[PDB]
Amino acid sequence: VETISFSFSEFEPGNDNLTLQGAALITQSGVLQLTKINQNGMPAWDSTGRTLYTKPVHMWDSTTGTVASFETRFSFSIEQPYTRPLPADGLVFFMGPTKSKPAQGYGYLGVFNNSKQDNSYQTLAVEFDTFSNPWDPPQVPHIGIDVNSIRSIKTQPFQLDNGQVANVVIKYDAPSKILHVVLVYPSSGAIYTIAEIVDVKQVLPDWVDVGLSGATGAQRDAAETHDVYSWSFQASLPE
Amino acid sequence: VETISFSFSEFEPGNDNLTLQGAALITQSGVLQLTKINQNGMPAWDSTGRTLYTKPVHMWDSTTGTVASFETRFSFSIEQPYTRPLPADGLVFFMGPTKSKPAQGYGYLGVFNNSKQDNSYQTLAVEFDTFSNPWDPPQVPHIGIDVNSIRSIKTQPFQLDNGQVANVVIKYDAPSKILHVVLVYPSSGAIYTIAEIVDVKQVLPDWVDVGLSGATGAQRDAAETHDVYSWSFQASLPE
Numbered sequence: 185v186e187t188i189s190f191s192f193s194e195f196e197p198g199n200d201n202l203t204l205q206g207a208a209l210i211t212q213s214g215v216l217q218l219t220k221i222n223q224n225g226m227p228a229w230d231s232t233g234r235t236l237y238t239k240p241v242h243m244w245d246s247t248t249g250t251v252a253s254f255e256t257r258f259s260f261s262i263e264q265p266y267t268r269p270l271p272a273d274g275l276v277f278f279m280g281p282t283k284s285k286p287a288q289g290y291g292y293l294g295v296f297n298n299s300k301q302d303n304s305y306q307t308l309a310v311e312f313d314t315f316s317n318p319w320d321p322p323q324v325p326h327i328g329i330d331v332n333s334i335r336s337i338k339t340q341p342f343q344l345d346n347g348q349v350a351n352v353v354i355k356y357d358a359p360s361k362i363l364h365v366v367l368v369y370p371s372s373g374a375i376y377t378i379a380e381i382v383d384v385k386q387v388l389p390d391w392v393d394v395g396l397s398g399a400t401g402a403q404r405d406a407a408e409t410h411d412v413y414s415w416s417f418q419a420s421l422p423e
Numbered sequence: 424v425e426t427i428s429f430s431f432s433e434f435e436p437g438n439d440n441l442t443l444q445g446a447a448l449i450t451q452s453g454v455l456q457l458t459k460i461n462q463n464g465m466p467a468w469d470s471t472g473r474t475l476y477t478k479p480v481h482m483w484d485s486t487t488g489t490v491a492s493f494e495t496r497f498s499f500s501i502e503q504p505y506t507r508p509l510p511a512d513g514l515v516f517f518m519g520p521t522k523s524k525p526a527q528g529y530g531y532l533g534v535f536n537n538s539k540q541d542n543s544y545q546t547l548a549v550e551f552d553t554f555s556n557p558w559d560p561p562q563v564p565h566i567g568i569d570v571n572s573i574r575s576i577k578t579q580p581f582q583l584d585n586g587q588v589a590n591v592v593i594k595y596d597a598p599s600k601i602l603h604v605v606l607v608y609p610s611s612g613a614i615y616t617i618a619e620i621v622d623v624k625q626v627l628p629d630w631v632d633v634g635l636s637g638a639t640g641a642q643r644d645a646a647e648t649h650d651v652y653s654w655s656f657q658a659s660l661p662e
């Protein structure tokens with residue numbers, strides 16, 4: 185079995201294993217701030233940032249046809265401090281082509297280029313979306329499973345517990361092709377679950393980069409924080 | 424759509440909507456004790472008890488072929504107070520033939536008759552198993568998805584947080600045939616997830632009873648509590 189595994193119980197400036205893109209940065213206190221936090225401690229609009237683990241992950245073997253199973257967990261918080269306008273845009277875990285650069289911001293969350301499905305994206309993503317765009321369900325926030333498109337194949341509304349830490353667990357089982365996602369807020373005890381069938385050998389390239397991305401909005405104060413406190417990942421490809 | 428829904432935020436002696444079988448009883452404090460708690464407050468061995476909701480649930484239409492999706496949530500605690508012998512046997516959520524009576528106890532958890540697969544059981548169950556029997560994986564406790572057999576098609580180990588309350592969420596989506604299960608311990612923050620493909624039209628009868636069952640062991644003090652604090656359920660069958 186070809187395996188890869190990492191675990192950041194907190195982040196540290198200078199860590200060898202993370203690529204930082206766009207606005208993303210790691211604080212001395214150990215927090216990955218995906219989108220810009222201004223001097224006043226307030227989140228900035230028009231910001232997009234991502235992090236990628238530095239080593240690619242082998243998701244399927246082009247010779248034998250084996251396919252990997254994987255699990256990722258992370259803790260994040262989103263604080264929406266402005267009474268108006270509406271907050272935006274969200275954060276997302278994503279897997280796709282290696283040597284990956286940020287895509288479009290705002291509702292595309294730094295991962296996609298427009299709102300059409302395009303199998304060439306070869307990207308699978310799990311979003312926590314805070315702004316209802318023309319292609320979105322009305323309930324925000326919502327968890328979304330995105331396969332080669334920002335228009336989720338399936339969503340599940342969740343109530344934001346403003347500024348509180350959410351724990352996320354995402355598992356993909358190759359034999360069953362089931363991607364299952366869980367969101368828990370220790371603060372309120374709320375638990376959300378969503379699952380869908382995903383054929384990763386069809387969707388993803390055989391090797392991928394894995395990362396997290398966040399975006400704030402297209403007008404003044406359509407913003408919120410996208411802070412991440414820990415992140416772990418494990419994948420196993422049968423041989 | 425033909426729907427059925429119930430929610431017990433706590434239990435109350437005399438409630439119209441619950442059938443109590445075997446050792447199960449509801450306390451004045453609002454707790455469903457599935458297995459017997461002795462005068463001294465200690466759990467009794469050789470005990471089996473179940474509860475069933477009083478109305479049957481329509482899981483699939485024998486005429487049109489539609490199939491129901493459903494969700495159930497409940498909170499329970501298991502306290503293993505004896506240093507020896509090993510604790511046993513576990514508790515379980517189950518769906519199967521109506522007019523259902525308790526089956527065999529101990530490792531069969533009040534739901535099955537022996538350890539062989541038998542499609543005639545027409546039963547789907549999600550177990551939280553505390554004793555490793557001859558047909559079980561070694562890690563206990565474990566979550567198990569049981570389809571017509573006490574020998575789970577898939578299991579996931581979990582650490583007991585002794586005497587603490589666990590929150591369970593189980594969802595079945597007919598279109599994808601995915602049964603997904605989540606266990607969370609607010610006390611420790613632990614989160615467990617397990618999912619598998621289940622064809623309910625093949626497994627279950629068109630109408631079922633839904634219930635919870637618990638069992639303690641076959642020798643003195645191979646026992647633990649199986650207390651339930653709340654339970655909700657919702658099913659929708661397309662028309």
Ligand SMILES: OC[C@H]1O[C@@H](O[C@H]2[C@H](O)[C@@H](O)[C@H](O)O[C@@H]2CO)[C@H](O)[C@@H](O)[C@H]1O
Pocket residue numbers: 269270271272273290291292315317400401402403406
């Ligand atoms: O309000 C945040 C929201 O903005 C959308 O873009 C708007 C923009 O804010 C508005 O000033 C302009 O007139 O229209 C744009 C839409 O065409 C983003 O698309 C959305 O994702 C959020 O960021």
Ligand SMILES: OC[C@H]1O[C@@H](O[C@H]2[C@H](O)[C@@H](O)[C@H](O)O[C@@H]2CO)[C@H](O)[C@@H](O)[C@H]1O
Pocket residue numbers: 508509510511512529530531554556639640641642645
């Ligand atoms: O120890 C609890 C455990 O007991 C198993 O049954 C045992 C029994 O405890 C022992 O005294 C007897 O000699 O052998 C039995 C097994 O053949 C139950 O099967 C198991 O589910 C637990 O309840």
Ligand SMILES: [Ca+2]
Pocket residue numbers: 273274291313314315316317320
């Ligand atoms: Ca959106």
Ligand SMILES: [Ca+2]
Pocket residue numbers: 512513530552553554555556559
């Ligand atoms: Ca067992």
Ligand SMILES: [Mn+2]
Pocket residue numbers: 311313320321326328334336
């Ligand atoms: Mn969305």
Ligand SMILES: [Mn+2]
Pocket residue numbers: 550552559560565567573575
């Ligand atoms: Mn078992």
